[PDB]
Structures are given as C-alpha cells and as structure tokens.
Amino acid sequence: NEKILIVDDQSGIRILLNEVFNKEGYQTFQAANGLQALDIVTKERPDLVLLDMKIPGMDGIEILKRMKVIDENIRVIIMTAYGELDMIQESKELGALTHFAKPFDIDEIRDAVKKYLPL
Ligand SMILES: [Mn+2]
Structure with a gap:
C-alpha cells in the first residue's frame, strides 16, 4: 500500500x-495548506508529497523542513510557478527529488512519481 499526499x-x-494517482493504484491524501499537510504527514506518514510551493500564507521551504523532521523518510517533489532558483536550490539541499512548473504536463508528473515511487 504506497502513499502520496497532494498539497x-x-x-x-x-x-x-x-x-491521477488514485487510478494508478496509490493511496492518496489531500491538503489545502501547510498545517493540514503537516497533520497528515504526522498521522499518515505518506511516502511521497507533491508540494505546491505557492499557497497564500505558506512558506513552502519551511513545511518541507518540518515534514522532514516529523518523518525523515518522506520524499518530496515541489511544484512551482513557471520560475525560482533560490527556492529550488533550497529544496534540493533539503533532499527534494525534483521540481515541476505549473501549468504541468500530467503525463510527465505521472511518469516522474512512478519512477521515484514505483508501485
Ligand atoms: Mn497554489
């Protein structure tokens, strides 16, 4: 039973x-902001997180940090705006698997997670 959290x-x-990932066979969870996200990481301990880095009031890099602490085994793929070098460098340093810009190519994301989190 593989878990993916979508933030x-x-x-x-x-x-x-x-x-998309539910059809793929993964056990999925959803969050609309960082706090719910942190909550689910704690109670569900998902294997992979798709992190939207642009949520009002949310410091993307910080939730990443916290997630890593709560569960240092969790892998993250960050979602950005069609841009940001410092953010990417920071997430890379924190262990982020990779990043994708919005609007994204569904097939590309799909292929990426099955590669990083085979079913
Ligand atoms: Mn957003």
Whole structure:
C-alpha cells in the first residue's frame, strides 16, 4: 500500500492530481495548506508529497523542513510557478527529488512519481 499526499490550495488542480494517482493504484491524501499537510504527514506518514510551493500564507521551504523532521523518510517533489532558483536550490539541499512548473504536463508528473515511487 504506497502513499502520496497532494498539497495544493486550488481544489480543481488538487482533485485532478489526486485522481491521477488514485487510478494508478496509490493511496492518496489531500491538503489545502501547510498545517493540514503537516497533520497528515504526522498521522499518515505518506511516502511521497507533491508540494505546491505557492499557497497564500505558506512558506513552502519551511513545511518541507518540518515534514522532514516529523518523518525523515518522506520524499518530496515541489511544484512551482513557471520560475525560482533560490527556492529550488533550497529544496534540493533539503533532499527534494525534483521540481515541476505549473501549468504541468500530467503525463510527465505521472511518469516522474512512478519512477521515484514505483508501485
Ligand atoms: Mn497554489
């Protein structure tokens, strides 16, 4: 039973992604901000997190940090705006697997997670 947590403030996109990986066979979870995200990491200890780095009021790099502390075994793929070098460098230093810019290529994300989190 492999777990993926999808963190994104936009319901449309979040639900979209959740279904993509649910159809793939993964056990999925959803969060709209960092606090819920942190909550689920704690109670569910998901294997992989798709982290939207642009959520109002949320410091992306910080939630990454916290997630790593709560569970240093969790791997993360960050989702950015079509940009940011410092953010990427910081997430790389923290162990982030890779990053994808929005709007994203569904097939690309899909292939990426099956590669980093085979079923
Ligand atoms: Mn967002």
